[PDB]
Amino acid sequence: LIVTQTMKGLDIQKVAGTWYSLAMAASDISLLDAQSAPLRVYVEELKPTPEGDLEILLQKWENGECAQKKIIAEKTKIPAVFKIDAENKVLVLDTDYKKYLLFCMENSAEQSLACQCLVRTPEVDDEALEKFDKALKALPMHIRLSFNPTQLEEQCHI
Amino acid sequence: LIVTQTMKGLDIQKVAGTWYSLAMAASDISLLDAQSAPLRVYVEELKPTPEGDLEILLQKWENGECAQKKIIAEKTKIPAVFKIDAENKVLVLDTDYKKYLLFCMENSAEQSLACQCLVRTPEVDDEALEKFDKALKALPMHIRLSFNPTQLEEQCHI
Ligand SMILES: CCCCC/C=C\C/C=C\CCCCCCCC(=O)O
Ligand SMILES: CCCCC/C=C\C/C=C\CCCCCCCC(=O)O
């Protein structure tokens, strides 16, 4: 239960659409170190279901190539928290729907933790990056990556 | 000439001895991404020469093993700036000699840039890490790593 920042008033339907993983951080280096690392995933689109589950389109480098993944985060009794089917919960820390979204993924244990700053456009948002860094300043992150606009328009951010 | 933080009054003899690379950052992900990445070096000891050159003992992972390296930074007319023989200049941004040292290495071009927060002891110094983050906040860093006390007592921080 390491993360104690959640979005109050979250309307999950309003996060539907295109996002860019501007920045990522994790608790352990190995979670993001290699391009095939377990939590180095690049968000493409969020597709909230009518009953409040969250289908996720993303890219991940596997076996020497940029692969497409589709996964579903199921709703919980808490609007800002979803569970991935594999126990790994996803939490929405903050979002303004129109520009940025900060979320973390953590495992039930440790804990193991990865967070991203998502943005709507392939641009460096300094002010979403500051909110991201503010949110993680107490979290025990040991790796942090960010991407430039060119990489953001590339599959797997090459 | 991207870095415009240098230590005034630097006495290079007083940086001799044992250091730990508590944290590292770089301008491009690939400079630190892999464990065999070009700038993922782990400082061991600094050995200032009598005439002001700076011999450096460090570790770097090469060809599937933690290798020992010994390199020399030659003095320039500027006390806080040394050149490595290979044009890559090293700059000392700040140090209190007894606890922390911040430096950057950059190539003549880009520029390509790597900085570290060095510390005397295998401990997380939050206040040297804040000075490190403050010094890099305007620099265009896209990867950032930090190590825990256990890793700090391991060769190549395993
Ligand atoms: C509200 C926004 C939420 C966005 C959530 C984004 C990603 C979901 C979290 C983690 C996904 C785990 C890694 C990808 C799994 C694919 C299988 C694998 O290769 O291991
Ligand atoms: C005042 C403290 C200065 C400390 C300087 C530390 C390191 C020097 C900077 C860069 C070293 C380049 C990478 C190692 C070179 C070995 C050859 C290689 O494998 O490419």
Question: Pairing mode, if any, of strands B20-26 and A54-62?
Answer: unpaired
CA distance B134 to B130: 6
What is the token pair recorded at A4?
A: 């104690």
Lookup result for tokens 């990867």: B143
What is the token pair recorded at A88?
A: 């790994």
Which among A76, A99, A78, A74 has a CA at the least distance from the CA of A6? A78
**DSSP per-residue codes, A95-153:** E-SSSEEEEEEEE-----EEEEEEESSSS--HHHHHHHHHHHSSS---EEEE--HHHHT
CA distance A53 to B56: 55
CA distance B89 to B74: 9
Are A34 and B29 within 8 A, CB to CB?
no
Give the residue whose CA is nearest to atom 9 of ligand 1.
Answer: A105
CA distance B72 to B23: 22
Are B34 and A34 within 8 A, CB to CB?
yes
- Give the helix ranges, DSSP H, for chain B: 126-136, 149-152
CB-CB: which of A29, A35, A146 is closest to B145? A29
The structure's method of determination equals X-ray
Are B145 and A147 within 8 A, CB to CB?
no
What is the token pair recorded at A143?
A: 């790796």
Q: How far is CA A22 from the centre of its chain?
A: 10
Strand partners, A58: A43, A69
Q: Which run of H or of E encompasses A91?
A: strand A88-95
Lookup result for tokens 């600094």: B46
Task: Return the CATH number of the domain spanning residue range B1-158.
Answer: 2.40.128.20
Collect all residues with Cβ–Cβ distance below 8 Å to B127 and sequence separation of at least 6.
Answer: none
Resolution value (Å, 1 decimal): 2.1
CA distance A138 to A134: 8
Centre of ligand 1 from the C-alpha of residue B32, in Å: 24
Strand partners, A71: A56
